[PDB]
Amino acid sequence: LEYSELYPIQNEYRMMQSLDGMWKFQFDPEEIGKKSGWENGLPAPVSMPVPSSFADFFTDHKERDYCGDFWYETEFYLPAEWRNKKIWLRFGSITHRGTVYCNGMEITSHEGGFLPVLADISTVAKPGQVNQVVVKINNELNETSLPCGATKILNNGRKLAKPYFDFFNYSGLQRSVWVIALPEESVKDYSVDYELCGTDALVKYEVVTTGEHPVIVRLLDAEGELVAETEGKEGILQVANARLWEVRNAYLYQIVILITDVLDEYREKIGIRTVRIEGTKILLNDRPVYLKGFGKHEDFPILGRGFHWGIVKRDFECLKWTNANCFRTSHYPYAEEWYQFADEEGFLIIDEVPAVGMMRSTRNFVAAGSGNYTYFFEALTVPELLKSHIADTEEMITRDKNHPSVIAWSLFNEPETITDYAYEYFKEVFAAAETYDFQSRPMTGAFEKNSKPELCKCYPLCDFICLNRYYGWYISGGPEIEEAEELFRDEMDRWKAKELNVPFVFTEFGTDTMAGLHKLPSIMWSEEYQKEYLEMNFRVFDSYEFVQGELAWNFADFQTTEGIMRVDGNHKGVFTRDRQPKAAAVVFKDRWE
Amino acid sequence: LEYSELYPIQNEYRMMQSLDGMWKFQFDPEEIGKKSGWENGLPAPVSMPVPSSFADFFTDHKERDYCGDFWYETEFYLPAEWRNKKIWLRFGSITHRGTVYCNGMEITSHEGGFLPVLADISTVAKPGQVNQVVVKINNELNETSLPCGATKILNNGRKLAKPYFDFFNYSGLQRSVWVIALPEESVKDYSVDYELCGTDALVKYEVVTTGEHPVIVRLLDAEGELVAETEGKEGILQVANARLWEVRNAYLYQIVILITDGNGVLDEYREKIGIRTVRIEGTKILLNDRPVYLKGFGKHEDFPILGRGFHWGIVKRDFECLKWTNANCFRTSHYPYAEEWYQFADEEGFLIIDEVPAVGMMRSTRNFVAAGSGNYTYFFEALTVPELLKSHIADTEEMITRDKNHPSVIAWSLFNEPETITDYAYEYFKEVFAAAETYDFQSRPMTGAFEKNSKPELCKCYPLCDFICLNRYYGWYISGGPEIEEAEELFRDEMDRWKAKELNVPFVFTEFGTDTMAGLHKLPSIMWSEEYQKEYLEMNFRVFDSYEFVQGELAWNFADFQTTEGIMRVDGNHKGVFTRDRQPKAAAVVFKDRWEKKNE
């Protein structure tokens, strides 16, 4: 990379200052901003909270559904003491594409709206004065960046996003923004890997700095006492009587990285843990673990994908209530704070890159069950798609690798995988992913039903196999649910017959469920049917030895593109959007207990 | 006040650092925290978001409904650069009571859960190091502080809050927390007052500092250019062709206060203010000498999961909805809101009735129905009334000192629905109004909201008010449904009695509404349906428009909000015109159409 992905901290060597609050905001429908010098300040702005998605604040269609260029602006005072430091703007994310300006100068551009953006403003920053940042953002959708979709142009010239994915195209500055000051020679990146040796543990590490001075690495336990110390950008910390990080029983050490001439110090909490695939088993610290939990979303009323600690608190309290131990970051990397808390709460995370919508369809959720092939990986643009896919894969892994909670990388969700065009594509992604991960932890992806065991060319790439199946909803279901169970067992029997000796994890299954809709006997959208559907699925899961995980879809109701198949978003949630349990929630709780 | 109510800013002289995030948290039911040394750190904490209310996070009754002592803890790094400055911990609020500890030392205690708490940690802070904050908080209810209520003890010994008011007892650290650094000689407070002169305006000001050095005051326009400059802690800025701050058309000047020692600047404070006058003349409410008709809502700091936790996103959405209904005003029921509400109201040009938490001054754990009903509870005859008065006046001073310079704040509400039919009540509020008047440099209109028991024949407290705020529920609590025609006549009868008194003061209806289930449709209407909400409002509109001295209508409520659970509250109060998720019910359009045209 060309910047540090590390989470900002505050010490004697590093400073940070928040830019969160009310920013200036202006739509640029005619796209004349750059021509008109908006990079020096917006001419007629409104107020916009940062962090948040902008869409749900407004009361008119034009603004909520805005697609194209729009601008942010704010001012901030730089402390005079920040002089002669490397000064960076750190955006938690810019969705989807952006150009950062500071004091009139173009600093950097970024592609991908769910990972941090860093802008080196050292030479242009004015310490001891008020400074200006202006950001030009674009939220269009294409097939050359993630996530994939299309942008429709109406006859008045207004643009409209047409996703190939099933969630609303929220955008803006949805995560916290910092200005930070680093020493001229600094810790840029680090990596840990773990090995268990009886009661001892080895922490293999790697450190990348912006200079050549010696590096000291210390490991402190939860109370701050030194347990290991090494020198070098590569080495091994030896921990006697290591207190291992356990599922729903976390222990966190604090790693301390020092550049000495001290020139720089970085601290971060980590957990000693191993993850391995052996046969059909997923081994955490050598003991088989069964994944229980949900696919989630960064989604909440009014805030959109805007981060807030309160959402995290309620969501984890609910997870623990259902006795879950895992969730997948569908369908994109979350705000860094989610992983930090998962580390402390002892939750497992399948970390997913935004590789969703790689099958050309504007109502993809039902097109996944009919095998109509869209020639997606045969397009003239896929080299661009692959490059940005690998880029997002790199940024995610560099960012999240040192979290103990992250046990696997999901590198796609429901793409076309039945041709060799697809295989050659993902062969590259998997190769790249393994290169970026210091731990080489399990790599997988979520397959849709179209990827028949007889046709799929991509599952051999996976360390374990994640299936999204909706036998009971999109396939048969309702009156035909007994046929759905027969069809479901039939596909699993075919997978079993392959004798792959790899773990299978169901990463999606569910039914849209209206809070309050009761029916006796049950009907598809009712609360009772959600329960009956789950119990049928549970029966199938328990019929196969190599099934080692069940992640239900979804944790909570979330916002989608409006259409004839989405009644105010997606209602396959087990909890409502306001985080209250439907009837089927206790079914998970009793089972997972 | 022995601290600066001023909102923290960042410049060459002042520094600030946010303490928001995940704090450590622990309930203290046996109330053994201090004796066990929790002030040095909590022994077995959980994680807790700041800012937020704690109640809605948990999944069990015992924790959601917790009443008593509970603790917060966090750590923070102090820049070495802050050495030899005055360092303060600034809580937006601590609900309801608190003692702040820093690095093991007791710093300060505070009573009142809706106004800033400032704790001077200058002598205990350790620059260049990690520092520790611990807060002991209590959220019980009594009759010696605001808001009023009782604390019930269950059979198992667990405490339970029993409010005399109709909103849930959210508590904790519900607003932003800062650590800030000030110069040793600093601006502690200032006040502005305005006088209009044709096309010109005067800005009268007063400045309070912690020292004796000269003060320079500058006034900048919205483009940052100088329009006036004078020197001295008291003085007048003269503005030619003044751009007045107007309703739904705000213009904000920036005032700049400088402490100079003449070879340098010792301190600088900036704030946006609006040139505006507010006055009562006869039955008219005059903004910039123009009679204005108040249109809007009573609100609540209330949102799913967050409780009363502040968030800019809530503010943005709520103001977009307000502008959509063509409102120009809202009341901060029943407590001062987070400061950011006022800042944005200044920018959006909304009028604000700023209300102190003097709610629940009638002993009843079912107060919303105990109204209209004529039961006297001897509330102001208790031996605790002197102590209640002290904290009431204390909250008033803090509120007024904090919000006085906001152009949006046009009036102070000093109570909501107390007992007012005895001289005990009169003597009580006479003190409050007197105190309130001394604290306000502008001496703007002062009022309170009267409930129906405060009959025109019996009420002793309305003469204290510059204008009169009435909460009435004719066609809900009184003769609702089939009897709505009887409701209208009863309403006209009371207004006729008020009219007959020839008081020559403005009357403002600060509450009226019906509980309304989103989705409940009925033809013909029934109470609780969306259609009835519409019909109820229109009967009320007819009565409102029948009296010239009626100069404002604030519907109750802007949005559905959380209350104590009971047989009359279906998941809180549903008199909202919007849902709790901020989406409009059918009656929202009714206001939009009326307020679009309704003026004067």
Ligand SMILES: O=C(O)[C@H]1CNC[C@@H](O)[C@@H]1O
């Ligand atoms: O249809 C559904 O509910 C799901 C199907 N597969 C992908 C998800 O994003 C989508 O939301």
Ligand SMILES: O=C(O)[C@H]1CNC[C@@H](O)[C@@H]1O
């Ligand atoms: O009954 C009601 O809905 C209202 C009556 N007057 C006071 C409010 O706090 C209360 O919520």
